[PDB]
RNA sequence: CGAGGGCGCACCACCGGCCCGUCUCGCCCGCCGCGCCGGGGAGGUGGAGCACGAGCGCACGUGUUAGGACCCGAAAGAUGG
RNA sequence: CGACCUGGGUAUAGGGGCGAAAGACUAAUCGAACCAUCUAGUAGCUGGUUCCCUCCGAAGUUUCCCUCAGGAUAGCUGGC
RNA sequence: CUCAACCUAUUCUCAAACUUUAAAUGGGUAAGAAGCCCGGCUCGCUGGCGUGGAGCCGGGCGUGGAAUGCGAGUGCCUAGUGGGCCACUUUUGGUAAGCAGAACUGGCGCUGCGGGAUGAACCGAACGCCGGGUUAAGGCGCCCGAUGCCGACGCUCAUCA
RNA sequence: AGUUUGACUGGGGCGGUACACCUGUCAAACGGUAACGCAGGUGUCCUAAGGCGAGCUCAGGGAGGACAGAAACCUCCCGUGGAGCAGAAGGGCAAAAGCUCGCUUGAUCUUGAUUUUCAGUACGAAUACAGACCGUGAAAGCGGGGCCUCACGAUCCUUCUGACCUUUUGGGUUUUAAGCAGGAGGUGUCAGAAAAGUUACCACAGGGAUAACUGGCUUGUGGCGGCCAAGCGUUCAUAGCGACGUCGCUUUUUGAUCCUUCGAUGUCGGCUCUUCCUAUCAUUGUGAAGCAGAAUUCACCAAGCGUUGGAUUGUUCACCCA
RNA sequence: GUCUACGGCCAUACCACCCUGAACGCGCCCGAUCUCGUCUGAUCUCGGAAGCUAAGCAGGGUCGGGCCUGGUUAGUACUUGGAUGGGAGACCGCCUGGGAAUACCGGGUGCUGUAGGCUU
């Protein structure tokens, strides 16, 4: 798919649709002190060996893209996450399509 | 033979107190004579009563037989239970009531004759009303009880308010998952 | 092993009927709705929103909410061994006024005029409807004709 | 294995309870050793208040 | 005996009302602390709630469960000899 | 006449020993001895489950389950 | 002159996954008192309009508005079961099967009894202990109850009837 | 050293996925309805292929026009859709839902209700509203994704976003952490364990719920017959045969099934021995011939009697010698 | 008796060809300055009124096609329930009720609402 990257939608914030910013979520990195990450730790040191499951049964071939939408009002720098369905490719901002047009020989 | 289902033939019904007091009994064999004898159908309806078990036979508190009474027209009547009648502490006056009860509680009955009531038994009002003329007839509230609480559709159905059976109540007790939208589902 | 889908085996429940396609005539949309009255659900299949689900086609419910474009219907639902009320949003394109009641409604204020003329005229008039009765005794002419003779016909291999 | 509607319940009977059980059969014996000793203590602190300081 | 009429128990259906959570809208009030303070309203919605208590203790029955667990039954595993 | 047969004395002990090797032998027990204990181990599996009369009286189907010899669930049953 | 394709009007034969038409059996709803008809009141909804809609408050109407039958409503606790099988009919796979798989009703399982010699299911009929009467399905040479009727009319000779 | 090494399944394995879904049919004119039933499809794709508005008409054909032809573009006419609408199929659709333009982001923020599967639980998907904020159009309106039916995912954990929000334990400040609300990272065995083999050295609990051997149903296949008679038979359908078709029987073949047996019915062949069957090889008595005789072939009554010795091979079968 | 504007049902209204059309109307028609769109004032939009019913439109016609409605087909096909009916079967008959569809043969060829005109 081909999301523009400015799009102008509802802001909480502000209340009312406004322009915004669009780029694509990454996951962020892991903190080592989060409660769970803490629990896995205690959990994992010492005698037992691995003490959580190893999915290891991947099956899905694509994620669900996220989109990061951020008002650019200056002051209401609002974040939003919107979710689109799944994608095998896709690209943020890209060359629009036209019709009537030769494809390449 | 015959096309017919045998499955409701036998009504089920008490046709006798299961107690054993006597003093039960004995009113139970007063008032199924006047029953029988009479065509009032107030004496059908208190020895029917006097068969019933303790949980349909709810106790009558005093607010709500003081309200009952206060109704127009009902001056000057008898209200009868079959049942105890229990104090509320939570009236600050009580009138002249005519009253015949199964049990009066050791406090109710004291505010009841000092307001300058009357208590009956139930022997009592056959004599003073064979055919339960002039009478108010109460119940106290029979789904008055926890156990109404959890009845009827299950808890974990869409627009049921039942109670569940939980040991503990607390926020770790039956509250995370088909409770809220955030875990799982709500419903 | 059959599939869930929401139209399975609707291919002629939906269809249009012979030579009857295109635009919707426009008094089905004028059809005026209240709540209480009786509305046999169709289910057309030119429109495809507000659609019924196909165990309500041919089914009869009664109106208890009206919105801008459809309305809630209470219709009874047979699952297993009980019947329950089901509540269904349905646009106004797949109902039509039942005429079941519209006959009894009829009924009724032809009974209420006939009470009140046979009690201001002095009259009694049966207002029940009555099964057919047997045939009362009659007398049939044959009008100087004798009845003709009717025999059974001889067997030929037609063709 | 559940049946209807219940309570869920977590007994705390998987570990050999049994071998551990103190019953109170010498209830009412303690209580007269108890008493017997407390009697006996008064009589030693003659004047003295028998519940103590 | 009695057409009609009346007060209506319990309970059921429905409509209102009140309490806590959470939204939306909005205007007022309080004062030793004039505050990034405190209180209040209307309209939806979430609660195992209120709306003149019904529980507690004891006994018995039935059902479910943890225990040797209705009775008998492995191939095995472990500790020490 | 030999890598021969054999007594007695010694050494090696159980996931160990010993094996010119067959998973052989290790007290009639060996692809892990025997003894006692943990232990009445667990069993969705097999077998059994003790007096009389009266009344009512089924299911082998729905949904979910590493579910298919089992359960939960609805249904059908009885009692109050 | 002739044969193709093409077109036109006809003609033979078909369709579980084709269809104009279109049954039988079947599915839903209605057959009143919570109804009908009068007046009024409320609304922040709707709005040319005292407009619409809904709600509420009074009043008057009983020939109780098809047949037939039946006393209903409601709650709690709950066992067993969750291997099924058979028959008429419909029906899928298979050459077929006492095969495998569906639909409907009934049955067996859980059920004895009369009959089918015999038999889980067929036919009749379901059951407390008995006397008398009468039947069902089925029978009435003898086994073996009952034709030991002066039964009626035909058909049939089989050296595998 | 410890543990695991899915399920369904006309036994199990191998093969498939009938394991989560969607279309038509089965399906017996409401709905529901099975098999490793039939024909197929899905794990995507799309800032437009989403949302409005406007203007158009599509497939195909006929007739014409320089190059230009059977297909290049232009023109007229006919054209009920015979095209297109992303994809499987079904439905639906014409100043549409198709095509081309213009403007856009309703594919946004929210609370409930309902439908579908259903236990009337969830998820997913969907329907009708209500409250915001927007788009488009002159407006009525339409739009909170795709014309409809499919295109997907719990707890725990992680990660991001939001409240000048709550807690962070004697008080205060600040980092940090915990929380409340909403997205995402996924469990395809799709209501969601973290999982390789081998055993003939094997073990146990069971199973005739389930295979290997008999028996039973069936008889496709095997075997043996019949009907028709186009032909073969120097001629001549039928002495002897019998193509194309068609009707049967048999249970000495192999399948099909899984009813009995898994707290056991000893599983091939031979040897030995008895009996039975007839669909008769010989012998007795016969009929027919393309029966001169001899020999042979066909058929009838017929199972009384006989049907052998050996080489090779475990063989049954086979083949050869006599 | 008709028409116009807006319609309801959506062919008894459609399709092919022919004839007639008074009056209003509806059109065809004339032009591009403005408004507005085009490759093209053809369409659309705008400004008109010389001419014409040729066309659209209306009415009528056709042993017209279609469509609508009847008869026939036909108590046929199929079918609910029943039998210790028949038949080796395949299937068939009867009892009890319900009951079609072609071909073929007839008739018909828009009704109508609101508002506003014309018709001696
Ligand atoms: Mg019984
Ligand atoms: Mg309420
Ligand atoms: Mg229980
Ligand atoms: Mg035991
Ligand atoms: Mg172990
Ligand atoms: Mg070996
Ligand atoms: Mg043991
Ligand atoms: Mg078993
Ligand atoms: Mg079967
Ligand atoms: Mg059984
Ligand atoms: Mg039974
Ligand atoms: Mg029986
Ligand atoms: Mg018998
Ligand atoms: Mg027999
Ligand atoms: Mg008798
Ligand atoms: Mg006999
Ligand atoms: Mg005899
Ligand atoms: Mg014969
Ligand atoms: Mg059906
Ligand atoms: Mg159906
Ligand atoms: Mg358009
Ligand atoms: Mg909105
Ligand atoms: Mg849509
Ligand atoms: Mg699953
Ligand atoms: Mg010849
Ligand atoms: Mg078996
Ligand atoms: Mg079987
Ligand atoms: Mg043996
Ligand atoms: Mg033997
Ligand atoms: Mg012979
Ligand atoms: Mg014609
Ligand atoms: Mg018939
Ligand atoms: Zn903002």
Same mark, same amino acid.
């Given at each position: ?105 | ?187 | 092993?059959?599939? %869930? $889908? #929401?139209?399975?085996?609707? *291919? ?7 030579? @009857? =396609? ?57 699952? %297993? $061994? #009980?019947?329950?009320?089901? *509540? ?7 109902? @039509? =006024? ?62 | ?53």
């Amino acid at each position: 798919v081909n999301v523009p990257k400015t799009r102008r939608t509802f802001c909480k914030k502000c209340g009312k649709h406004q322009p915004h910013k669009v780029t694509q979520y990454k996951k962020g990195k892991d903190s080592l002190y989060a409660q769970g990450k803490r629990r896995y730790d205690r959990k994992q040191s010492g005698y037992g060996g691995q003490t959580k499951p190893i999915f290891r049964k991947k099956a899905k071939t694509t994620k669900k893209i996220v989109l990061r939408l951020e008002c650019v009002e200056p002051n209401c720098r609002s974040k939003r996450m919107l979710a689109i369905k799944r994608c095998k490719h896709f690209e943020l901002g890209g060359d629009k399509k036209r019709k009537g047009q030769v494809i390449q020989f | 033979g015959v096309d017919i289902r045998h499955n409701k033939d036998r009504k089920v019904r008490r046709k006798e107190p299961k107690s054993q007091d006597i003093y039960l009994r004995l009113l139970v064999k007063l008032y199924r004579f006047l029953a029988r004898r009479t065509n009032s159908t107030f004496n059908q309806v208190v020895l029917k009563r006097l068969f019933m078990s303790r949980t349909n036979r709810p106790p009558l508190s005093l607010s709500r037989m003081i309200r009952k009474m206060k109704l127009p027209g009902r001056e000057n009547k008898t209200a009868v239970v079959v049942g105890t009648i229990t104090d509320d502490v939570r009236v600050q006056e009580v009138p002249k009531l005519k009253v015949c009860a199964l049990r009066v509680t050791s406090r109710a009955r004291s505010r009841i004759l000092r307001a300058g009531g009357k208590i009956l038994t139930f022997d009592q009002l056959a004599l003073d009303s064979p055919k339960g003329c002039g009478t108010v007839l109460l119940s106290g509230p029979r789904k008055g009880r926890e156990v109404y609480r959890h009845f009827g559709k299950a808890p974990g159905t869409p627009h049921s308010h039942t109670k569940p059976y939980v040991r503990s109540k607390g926020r770790k007790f039956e509250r995370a998952r088909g409770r809220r939208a955030s875990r799982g589902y709500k419903n | 092993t059959n599939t %869930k $889908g #929401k139209r399975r085996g609707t *291919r002629y429940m939906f269809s249009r009927p012979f030579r @009857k =396609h295109g635009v919707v005539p426009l008094a089905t949309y004028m059809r005026i709705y209240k709540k209480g009255d009786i509305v046999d659900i169709k289910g057309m299949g030119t429109v495809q929103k507000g659609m019924p689900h196909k165990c309500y086609h041919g089914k009869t419910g009664r109106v208890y909410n009206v919105t801008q474009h459809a309305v809630g219907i209470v219709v009874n639902k047979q699952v %297993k $061994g #009980k019947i329950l009320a089901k *509540r269904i949003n349905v646009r106004i394109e797949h109902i @039509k =006024h039942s005429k079941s009641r519209d006959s009894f409604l009829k009924r009724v204020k032809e009974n209420d005029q006939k009470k009140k003329e046979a009690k201001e005229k002095g009259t009694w008039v049966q207002l029940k409807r009555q099964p057919a009765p047997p045939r009362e005794a009659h007398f049939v002419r044959t009008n100087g004709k004798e009845p003709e003779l009717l025999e059974p016909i001889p067997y030929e291999f037609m063709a | 294995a559940p049946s209807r509607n219940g309570m869920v319940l977590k007994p705390h009977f998987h570990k050999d309870w049994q071998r551990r059980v103190a019953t109170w059969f010498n209830q009412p014996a303690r209580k007269i050793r108890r008493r017997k000793a407390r009697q006996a203590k008064a009589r030693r602190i003659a004047p003295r208040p028998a519940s103590g300081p």
